[PDB]
Amino acid sequence: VPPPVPPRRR
């Protein structure tokens, strides 16, 4: 079960 992806908004 791959990781929770980061929020792609700086």
Added chain:
Amino acid sequence: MEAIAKYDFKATADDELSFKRGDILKVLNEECDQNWYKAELNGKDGFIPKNYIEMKP
């Protein structure tokens, strides 16, 4: 940087691109997000999460 996918990832946006668990990527740029790398695959270039790959610069 020799980028290597640890997991299978399907993009979430137009700026991002997909890779399958084990692709060899080419990191052309990184100068903003400490979460997204702009690498190369499949004749395209896009953002990929740093937690879905094992980095080896």
